[PDB]
Design a protein around this ligand. Structure first.
Ligand SMILES: [Cl-]
Ligand SMILES: [Cl-]
Ligand SMILES: [Cl-]
Ligand SMILES: [Cl-]
Ligand code: NA
Ligand code: NA
Ligand code: NA
Lengths: 70, 70, 70, 70, 70, 70, 70, 70, 70, 70, 70, 70
């Protein structure tokens, strides 16, 4: 690596099934329309409540991928 | 949302199961008293150990709800 | 101050009229039933949107007041 | 929210008329070509000067919007 | 611990005799009117001056205790 | 900028008329005897109270200016 | 405790099955060779991606234990 | 500067040479696409190792540019 | 407090006695020059060691005072 | 120094008699078995409470020392 | 050290030749008109761009020196 | 990885020739005695000054490596 640049994106996964589901969900959505993802760093784990249960988990994470062509 | 006001307190949720559990359990007691929980936010994930096993996951949280009374 | 023992709570004042407004309402609402609020400290400035205009600013502030000693 | 996958970007709105103004323009300009901006979050309040008067305030804010899922 | 929840409170101890006195003082006031306290985490050590000496030490700390009944 | 060596100092502007006001006075007062202030950066927004109304906002800001080089 | 002194080392747990597993996994290792660990503290949650899906989570935490005998 | 708006993204610059190189290289690709880079800000300096030698310096950066279109 | 302005500088206080001493000593010299010290704030507690004894406690502080001149 | 390299370990000092004692206490231990410690840095000040009073303070710090000979 | 106080100043070095040049440059300017400097701690590494290259590196650092006379 | 577990130690690199050298220097040492280090992470950049010039930089970072075999 001497000329390998990365782009760091921010997404917020959500799911009623917990942190891992949320992380997993958000990530599939990125890789979906984005080029080979490489890593993710969680920024925060939030949430909304209804009856008094976690309506949905919100896991903000930073996602990195490589840029290439030429 | 006209000009409501919110209250943010800090509860520590605990469970042997894991993070999700600890949070869910923590939010359980908080709601059992309070005034429709609107949102929560994880401050940290700690845990107590006995030997080579997690005794209890400790997920400290910030929960916000309504205070827009009169 | 040698017997002075203060208590710091957290609140989130909202307002469609900016930070100043959001701060002002929150604190007003707070005292409107609570004690003699001494000071406040801004934790974060956020907001919810609709189009490209802030429906309401969200200033969460830590507030403190002198407790009772005898 | 279980399919909701948001994207948080960062912007810096400027204004010679204070924080409120700087925040307002930034977000307006943002949506003026972008999607349905959900929320925003203040990262920093800065400013460039000339004499002893703020030429323009600089509010950098993280902004998020719902992505597309199907 | 599977169903052991905690509440995290904020107090500001004060004393002219230093950090430890301040911590000690504030804590006695909490335990005084509060249920069995469990731990405290210092948040900040501030102070006010008179002749040029620490009029009073201010040690903000977070205090945790257990919630129980049934 | 290769000889430009700036000095960053910290100040706290106060005002009963909100953040904007507090920021404005502080900087004005600063230059009213000091050099050519280049930029400023908000450290914290606080305030002292009386009833439930801010007696004066307290914006502490880091300010910088170009030093002298020859 | 009374005069106990503890060491805080820093490990990183990894697992294909989420935070809990990585947390649990990492500790087991520390326990395999270290005297009764007392507590852990999550420092971060990251993960490598060899594709659209998660290759495996990485939970980095600080583990604390005592030391005294003679 | 009337009331322009800026965009801040995050790139990771890499180089075996060192920090300076990694940043310079990172900024190279960022500019090669974007819209006159105004400023950058280092978020962290990381690096990959093979044995007893630095494989690649990794300087993550925040780059800001213009978005004041219409 | 009409619309005063304050100045915040950073001194490092030192003492073999302990934290309290180091701070008290640090504030001593600061005041011996400056302009009625209003408040202080501890930034960190460090210390130098020779062998198995604390050589000197180092408490870095932020001291604020008046600058509301004309 | 010139080409020295240091290790930073992390210990936790505890004492029934305040911060100083815990700080002092903890170090002594590190010194008891580690080659001339050079510096320490307070990371936190916490404490357990078995009642209204402080059972004992807990001061967690990072201790640094060198390593070179051959 | 029982009565050794320090002052902590803030400067922003600049240079087109990288972080080290910038650090080096800013420091010479301080020591130039200031009394024996003792240490510096980097606060941030920023920069401005022209053609798309680092017009100049900006390294904000905190500089410490001793105060003495009598 | 799959079930790997890593240790993060913390070293400090020093050099008369800037950040790179100190970074490079420090690591070499860790490598001299530690099994194939995998990654490093800059925690700070400081330096001692025995005069107007830099005596030598001090780069403190966290180095990570694995551990597993049996
Ligand atoms: Cl907090
Ligand atoms: Cl960020
Ligand atoms: Cl600071
Ligand atoms: Cl750390
Ligand atoms: Na989980
Ligand atoms: Na460099
Ligand atoms: Na003390």
């Amino acid at each position: 690596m001497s000329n390998h640049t990365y782009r760091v994106i921010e997404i917020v996964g959500t799911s009623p099934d917990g942190v891992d589901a949320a992380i997993q969900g958000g990530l599939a959505r990125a890789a979906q329309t984005m080029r080979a993802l490489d890593w993710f760093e969680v920024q925060s784990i939030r949430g909304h409540l209804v009856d008094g249960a976690v309506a949905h988990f919100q896991v903000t994470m930073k996602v990195g991928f490589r840029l290439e062509d030429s």
